[PDB]
Amino acid sequence: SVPGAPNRVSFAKLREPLEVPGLLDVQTDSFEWLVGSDRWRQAAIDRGEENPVGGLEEVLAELSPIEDFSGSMSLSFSDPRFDEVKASVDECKDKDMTYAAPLFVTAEFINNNTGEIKSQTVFMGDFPMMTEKGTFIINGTERVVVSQLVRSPGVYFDETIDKSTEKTLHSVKVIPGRGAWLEFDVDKRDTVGVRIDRKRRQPVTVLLKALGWTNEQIVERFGFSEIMMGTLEKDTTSGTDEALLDIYRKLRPGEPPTKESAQTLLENLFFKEKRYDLARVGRYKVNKKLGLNAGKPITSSTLTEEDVVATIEYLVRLHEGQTSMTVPGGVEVPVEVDDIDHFGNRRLRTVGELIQNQIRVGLSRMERVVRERMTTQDVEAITPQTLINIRPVVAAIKEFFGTSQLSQFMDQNNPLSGLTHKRRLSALGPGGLSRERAGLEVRDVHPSHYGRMCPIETPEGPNIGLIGSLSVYARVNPFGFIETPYRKVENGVVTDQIDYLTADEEDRHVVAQANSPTDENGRFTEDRVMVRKKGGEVEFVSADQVDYMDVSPRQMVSVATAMIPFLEHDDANRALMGANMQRQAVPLVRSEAPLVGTGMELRAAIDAGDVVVADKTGVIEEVSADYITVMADDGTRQSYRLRKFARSNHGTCANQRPIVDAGQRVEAGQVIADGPCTQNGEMALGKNLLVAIMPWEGHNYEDAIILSNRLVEEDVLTSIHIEEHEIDARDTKLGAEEITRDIPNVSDEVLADLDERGIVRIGAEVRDGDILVGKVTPKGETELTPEERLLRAIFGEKAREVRDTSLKVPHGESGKVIGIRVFSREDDDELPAGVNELVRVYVAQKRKISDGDKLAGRHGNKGVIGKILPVEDMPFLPDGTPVDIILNTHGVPRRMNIGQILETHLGWVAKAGWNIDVAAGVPDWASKLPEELYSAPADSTVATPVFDGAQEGELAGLLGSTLPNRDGEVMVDADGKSTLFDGRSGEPFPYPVTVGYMYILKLHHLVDDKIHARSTGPYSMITQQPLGGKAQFGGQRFGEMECWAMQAYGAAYTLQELLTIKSDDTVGRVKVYEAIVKGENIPEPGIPESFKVLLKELQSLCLNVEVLSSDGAAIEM
């Protein structure tokens, strides 16, 4: 499909009826809806939806008209419009600006007395805009807003077990989009009550009467249930007014018992749409569940007395065990409890809806000021400009993009990491679930996740289960529910019709498995087929009972999980580990696509956006490392600037490079420049290299890994890492700090590489302790000691009042300076208050693979390099080729991740071409293979989808059809094993060893940034203990369990020195340091300050405490 797609032969045997949709739609569609772009308008009206309203249009219409308390004044908003962005994305990133566009809305002031209308256009501020990649730019940093999973504004019934009596208690709560809650429950004594606005419980009959129902009507409607009649009998309230007064005094205990307010508050609490709203999704859910207004259009989202009575009837029917209910005027609906974890109840707040809510809050704040100062300015001399205060809305938008929990720095470790970050589904966040209520129950795989949330992919951190990844084929219902496609099946023949179903509606049909065998016409060729039914149960049903089928086997998995070959053979835990480790790969200096992979790796590469794609067909006029110029067929000229050695958010290098030649023809959408971690426009997260599966002298013992020195000499696993140091000069109580080259008391050996401005020159190499930016700060009173004055005298030191605070390379860091960015308010640049100049320095280094670095495959097999062997020591094949990596045999079987062996065998088959004989007909094991796989040359990449790829029999047959080597001798036998020689001894190994090619990748857990040490350093002022963390140069923790272990050893002295000398004991610490440096034996400790102060306090309490020596001897000190 992609014009520049390399030919990767595929093992798939099933034809996909639906292509994978745009993977970033989950963001772009939402933002288009928010801004009401014409594209979204057309795509929505195509659905038969008349006059779609954008998010901003919806919010503005809901906000207006704002009417004065007297009705003589009014204000209205409409017609939101957007102009061109101030600057391009790259310029904004380069200048620490925010990618935003002006927002204008037409505002009309109306005076109802004289009829004056004042209509103008009001600037509402700079609204941040989304880029083509589905991300935002704020203050120069790239950020992503992740979708949030939240409970929908429906009505939810449930049953629980009473803690005291162990009885069954049924309850219901009405959850609105905006407003107060309403809930009912049957007590353990069979008493039906209602809680209004979470307040104290009271009989439901009180609420029923307050709505105007008389005792006769209540008896008639609820006579079927004895508990309701008993509650009414025991209800000591009569008449509508008395019940209204009771409710009013319940909700407003401190207000006078006036009848007018008592009647008004109830109407204004639920039933009038000013302060209560179900948001057009809560209304839909309530109508569907209770069977109200069947077939009617959604006219209003307000609550009505009819549905409250219906909810009470539903609760009463549920308590008494009835299964079906019919409401007067409605349609029959089953009576059952609600599983809040079911995606028929959970909905998705996309970026658009979150920004809409923030804008709603801002405009709500604005409305108060507008209506307040409507009553303070002279009438008829009041334009919209005079009272439209846009500060609150801009402040709200800035706060959301700067401090909200959903807007996060994009995970820019590699293209796959960023792509999978944009498609997150986060249950945690404001309006989600409570911080301390994230129990193990919610973070579990419900059956409804199938086809809309991947069960394998999830972070390893504390958010396991709380954060998910959207599936490849899923999409978002305009109500926010996640839909997924299915093929319609009729009379047992699979049809090309595809319908999108939500989890709520999927349970009403029987869904067959994706890869069920079928004939050319589509009819099933089996009597019984595996299907999923209402409860998520998998069973076997006749061929005439199926209703739908999955579009493809890859429906359940996500983008990352779709890139693990032979995913059948890996356990769920190891698949999870591999999927998450794919997100931690660090881009290498030269990327290389895997020999054996999946067809997804192409699309995922393009949809990530890091690859440059030609917009229009044309000829490559000029190509260079920095930019590509294309002349379109229509005469238009395009220029694409490539980003070179740009530092990602996580310190990885984002270097791009072109893959086209001058004069070449490129089709529309063709990839013209490789991304940071792709080759020819497809994912290249790692390197494919030769692996032998055998233990080796114990160097690969306990999941360790052995590497050949070749990988160090050829820069196979080398990666470039860039660090950004920062400093600034601020105003102080003694004055302003200064950046200078004349820093005091340093030899010329130290500042040789500093420029005139005092900043390290570009291109110079720096090592830990080297000065980067020379900075000096004013000091206070000197008051030299006699010794210091003598030193001034004997060196002729003229008085100066500055102290050195120059920026220096942190401990254990080095590299070459590649860039400097300097800002200063004198150049009108925006800076923090009380700051004059700011400097940022970029230091780049070329890290090779070393001992301790973490490597891993795609199947969850991970380890650390325990040894790097000389090339001559590695076991080598009979032709002299030395293997690159050795993996221990004992780690494969018990981990249940045998898919790595499949990858090894298929990679060997791919590296050396194969040729299946057809002289006497196709071999019986080659019947299912497509003809395209009957032959292939060396280094021929192959594809094996996750759930439809190479079979065991096909792979076993292919292993014996590989082409010979240069000399004509086959290295690997039909079993995938080869006879390896010993590099050291030279004798052949007694038994053949499994050999092949494995795709392994370098994780971002390098030892260079994990080693830490501390003899003495800074200390915390609050608690006097050593600081914590590598950045602060802190010490290691010594917990209570370590103290228990030391006590169990009987090592009293070691524990004492750990708790006192190496801890908050200043005098002892200094004494021990002095003794060590001077060679004196370590002084003994004793009598800490805490005991001294405790003893002093005890004495202050007139308690004659004293310390005595021996078993009854005199005092000491």
Partner: protein, 98 residues
């Protein structure tokens, strides 16, 4: 010259049993990863797939003697829970001897 004959304690949290802290005689190695004797892995419940370890330096003479005598790894062959040996061949070492 300084590092010779100066034991250091190795620890890996959590410390469920006293053998979680053990003294070793340090020797300098290139690179940045600590090298741990295989036979003590079972004691530390550590595998070489990404685990880290903490090192503490005894200072006083009494502390050095305690580490050299009470806490030395070679002196803790037997587990304290049941007296059965703990630093014995495992995994690869078994397969060879078998």
């Amino acid at each position: 010259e300084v590092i010779a004959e100066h034991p250091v304690l190795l620890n890996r949290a959590p410390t469920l049993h006293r053998l979680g802290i053990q003294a070793f005689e340090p020797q300098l190695v290139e690179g940045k990863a600590i090298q741990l004797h295989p036979l003590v892995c079972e004691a530390f419940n550590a595998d070489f797939d990404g685990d880290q370890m903490a090192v503490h330096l005894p200072l006083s003479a009494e502390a050095q003697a305690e580490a050299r005598i009470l806490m030395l790894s070679s002196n803790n062959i037997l587990s304290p829970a049941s007296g059965k040996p703990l630093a014995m061949p495992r995994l690869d070492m078994v397969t060879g001897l078998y």
